[PDB]
Amino acid sequence: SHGLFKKLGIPGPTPLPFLGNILSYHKGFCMFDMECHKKYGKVWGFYDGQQPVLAITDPDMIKTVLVKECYSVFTNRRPFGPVGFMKSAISIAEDEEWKRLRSLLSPTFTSGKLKEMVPIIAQYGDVLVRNLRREAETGKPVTLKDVFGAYSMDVITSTSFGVNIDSLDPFFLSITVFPFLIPILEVLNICVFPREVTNFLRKSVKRMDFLQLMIDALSDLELVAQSIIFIFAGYETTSSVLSFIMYELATHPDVQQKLQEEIDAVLPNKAPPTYDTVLQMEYLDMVVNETLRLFPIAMRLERVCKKDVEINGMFIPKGVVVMIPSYALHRDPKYWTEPEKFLPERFSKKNKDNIDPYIYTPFGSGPRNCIGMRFALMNMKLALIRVLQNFSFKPCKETQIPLKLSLGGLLQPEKPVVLKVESR
Amino acid sequence: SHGLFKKLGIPGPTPLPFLGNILSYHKGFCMFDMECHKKYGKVWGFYDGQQPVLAITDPDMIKTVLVKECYSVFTNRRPFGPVGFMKSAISIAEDEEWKRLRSLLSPTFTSGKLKEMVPIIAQYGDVLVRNLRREAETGKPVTLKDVFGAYSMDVITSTSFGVNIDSLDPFFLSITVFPFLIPILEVLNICVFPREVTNFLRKSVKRMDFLQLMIDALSDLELVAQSIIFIFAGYETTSSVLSFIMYELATHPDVQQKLQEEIDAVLPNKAPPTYDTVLQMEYLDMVVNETLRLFPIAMRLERVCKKDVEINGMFIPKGVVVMIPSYALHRDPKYWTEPEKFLPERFSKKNKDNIDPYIYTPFGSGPRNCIGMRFALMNMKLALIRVLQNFSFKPCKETQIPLKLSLGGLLQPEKPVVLKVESR
Numbered sequence A, B: 001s002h003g004l005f006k007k008l009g010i011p012g013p014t015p016l017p018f019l020g021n022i023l024s025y026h027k028g029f030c031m032f033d034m035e036c037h038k039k040y041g042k043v044w045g046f047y048d049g050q051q052p053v054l055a056i057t058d059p060d061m062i063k064t065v066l067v068k069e070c071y072s073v074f075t076n077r078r079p080f081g082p083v084g085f086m087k088s089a090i091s092i093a094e095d096e097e098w099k100r101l102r103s104l105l106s107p108t109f110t111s112g113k114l115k116e117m118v119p120i121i122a123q124y125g126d127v128l129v130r131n132l133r134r135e136a137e138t139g140k141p142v143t144l145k146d147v148f149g150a151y152s153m154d155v156i157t158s159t160s161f162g163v164n165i166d167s168l169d170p171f172f173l174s175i176t177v178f179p180f181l182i183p184i185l186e187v188l189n190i191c192v193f194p195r196e197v198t199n200f201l202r203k204s205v206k207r208m209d210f211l212q213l214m215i216d217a218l219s220d221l222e223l224v225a226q227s228i229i230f231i232f233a234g235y236e237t238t239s240s241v242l243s244f245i246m247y248e249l250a251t252h253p254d255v256q257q258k259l260q261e262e263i264d265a266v267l268p269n270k271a272p273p274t275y276d277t278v279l280q281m282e283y284l285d286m287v288v289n290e291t292l293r294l295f296p297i298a299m300r301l302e303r304v305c306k307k308d309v310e311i312n313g314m315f316i317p318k319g320v321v322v323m324i325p326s327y328a329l330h331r332d333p334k335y336w337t338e339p340e341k342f343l344p345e346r347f348s349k350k351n352k353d354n355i356d357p358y359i360y361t362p363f364g365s366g367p368r369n370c371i372g373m374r375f376a377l378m379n380m381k382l383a384l385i386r387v388l389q390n391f392s393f394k395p396c397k398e399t400q401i402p403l404k405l406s407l408g409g410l411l412q413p414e415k416p417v418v419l420k421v422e423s424r
């Protein structure tokens, strides 16, 4: 099974026995993709243990995999286990079981359902502000992920259920080389999610929203599973990106102020953000997108090719994991001038047309893109408005400059993001 | 996972933890099915370890599973491992990979391709006769499987390749309870087929037939895999059924003689069997079918239901193994008068119409029935003609009467079949 890419004439790094190419991960998912893009070009292949993975960087082939051929060939991602009852989580569910969940959960983020949330989100921003107001009157450097995550959790627990609260590579490696082991642990009730975190949220907080539109077909224990996915995403993604944004706004203060100028213009007299005002602030949208260009928290996009196929002149055999190196594509000089620099004018209406939506995919594409994309943009933006309407952000003595990325996991920073905060 | 049949309102024996219902196998595949048919009726469910199995006995639902819904829902059988390169064997291959093999191997048993084999098979029958002539002049009781299997091998090695030669529940159990283990051994090169039997037939006997119609798309190592399936089937099935037949002909001598009468009538002056003469001997066909009613060597038919479905008023969930208890159906008094008795007049043109081809399925049905059905009938019949044209068969002092069936495995006898042979 280690000669497939040799047989198909697809270039790639030479795999070692059993391990595959996993030892190359010693600089992260990303430095590996950025490297292989340079060594081999538009298409290359490698192995996660015994699992062949084909990496593609061709926009047409990309568009083919995620959109044109999704329902037929590329419906599902790489199997993830041990999972337990989380196999039915929408992000993990396969084929027809996924099609049913995606439909039942689609109407949660309609432009009207989000618009219903602008009044309820509007509370914890003031909880957010007042919490940042206490650690700013004091010149104590702030850990931004913690105050954002406290906010992010406050939104996800209420935006979906309605509980108000003031929020104040160990073994997975083995899996890659031992995917044959996954059904082993599937019969041991072993979960990658420690069975004490799930027994907890197995609080069936349902009473006599996201919670609403479910019981309004669907089961109950699988309702738990979906809730975990949303609580996690709505928490960690928002917090993480909010931290990436504040770091970039401080090291680039001209961007931070020019943003502040737009916010106080659209919202005069520190006005309260509403749905329609947020969709008018362009420079805000540009800053968010440019951060997501530099820091796509998903790093990769994956689909299991579920039958033999010839797309865009390349044959692809059943079972191969097709992969899209999002991080590498967002940083490719063959599409971006000086790609390491935080330049939000890449996303201005003058220049926003010179960008392929299959090179820039921070939320995926096709029927299995990020179901929570529009929410995340809205939730984050409301945070950025309220936070920046009051405070500026300077680097501090401990602030990591330049910021190193962590290794594997998600796109997360090595040392936490800590910045000075000043009150306007 | 042990409450599915409880949830679906499907009756069945109460499963034990981990083991499922496998401890009930202590009287064989068959006494278990015959029992559960009586306890529960048209439909029941059980577990092979963690694997739910739904057993159906409704002719319409049967016809639906094997024919109407084969290509959509019930394309594949229960996964079998560890297999190695034998995953590509046609009997084992799944979905689209199977559709391609079945087409490429279909034209091997056209009525003309078989007709081409009547002259070549006609040799080893005389090799067969002369070998039985030596152990009959001596009143030494004969082991029939051995002289048949020697014949059966002589046909399969030449009918498919062309080499002429005078042919003179241990761990599988664990699998049922440890199906999660199968990919474990799949990475160890562990095969249920001892790697020394395969390294052998990996004799690539191909030179500068079944062998022919292959190289005339198809690979090479998978060509080996197909050859093993045919060599085995063409050997053991023929030998086994030939033995079941001779046992029944001896204990029922009126049938043995009335057969002998038909053979010497259609083939006067001990004439040589040809293609068209064999398809005129009806009473021969009746004897073969009635033996295959009592002794269906496959015992069961299985399909993995690959998506949610409602057939004939019963919902069936994805992943369940649907099963057809062939042995139990061939022995059901609700379709056969006095079903334990060897009565070949069940298959006479007067009475052959009162038989459902979805209760009587010795070769399966639908697109995945026995691809070698017509060959086996022909090969066996030529054996029966030549053998019975010369010798009678009496029970002997050691002959097992009544014959006990073995446990599990295939439909094979406990003590071997040994009978007296007399020369006419």
Ligand code: HEM
Residues within 6 Å of the ligand: A066, A090, A091, A092, A102, A229, A230, A233, A234, A235, A237, A238, A241, A292, A296, A297, A298, A301, A302, A361, A362, A363, A364, A365, A367, A368, A369, A370, A371, A372, A373, A375, A376
């Ligand atoms: C900055 C915030 C976020 C980013 C950058 C992001 C990005 C992504 C990406 C790249 C994917 C995979 C797309 C693909 O495979 O083609 C994805 C999937 C998904 N996201 Fe997000 N996401 C974010 C926030 C959220 C939030 C707040 C939710 C709330 C529920 C969410 C729910 C999901 C789900 C359920 C999936 C799986 C969808 C499916 O497989 O059908 N995400 N996201």
Ligand code: HEM
Residues within 6 Å of the ligand: B066, B090, B091, B092, B102, B229, B230, B233, B234, B235, B237, B238, B241, B292, B296, B297, B298, B301, B302, B361, B362, B363, B364, B365, B367, B368, B369, B370, B371, B372, B373, B375, B376
């Ligand atoms: C008395 C002789 C035989 C009997 C009773 C018999 C019976 C069966 C049965 C019941 C099946 C399963 C059908 C189903 O799942 O619906 C089967 C499949 C099969 N048989 Fe036979 N068989 C015999 C001889 C042979 C011979 C001589 C060959 C020679 C190649 C052969 C090749 C196969 C193959 C390849 C399959 C799998 C077909 C597929 O899955 O597409 N069999 N047989």
Ligand SMILES: O=C(CNC(=O)C(F)(F)F)N[C@H](CS[C@H](Cc1ccccc1)C(=O)NCCCc1cccnc1)Cc1ccccc1
Residues within 6 Å of the ligand: A077, A078, A080, A089, A091, A092, A172, A228, A229, A232, A233, A237, A297, A298, A370
């Ligand atoms: O994590 C991989 C990487 N594969 C691997 O082999 C590896 F060993 F490294 F782990 N794959 C995702 C499928 S499992 C994951 C399990 C989980 C984690 C935390 C909490 C609950 C469940 C999962 O549900 N995540 C998406 C849920 C939230 C989210 C995050 C980010 C953006 N939107 C939504 C598929 C996936 C990847 C990136 C983005 C979305 C979805």
Ligand SMILES: O=C(CNC(=O)C(F)(F)F)N[C@H](CS[C@H](Cc1ccccc1)C(=O)NCCCc1cccnc1)Cc1ccccc1
Residues within 6 Å of the ligand: B077, B078, B080, B089, B091, B092, B172, B228, B229, B232, B233, B237, B297, B298, B370
């Ligand atoms: O053996 C089961 C039972 N399942 C189980 O879980 C169990 F643990 F018990 F083993 N299933 C068959 C799929 S594997 C088998 C592997 C093999 C065996 C010997 C030589 C080569 C390969 C296989 O290729 N056999 C069919 C090949 C020859 C044949 C025999 C009889 C009739 N025609 C052809 C599927 C199957 C069953 C019955 C009849 C045909 C096909």
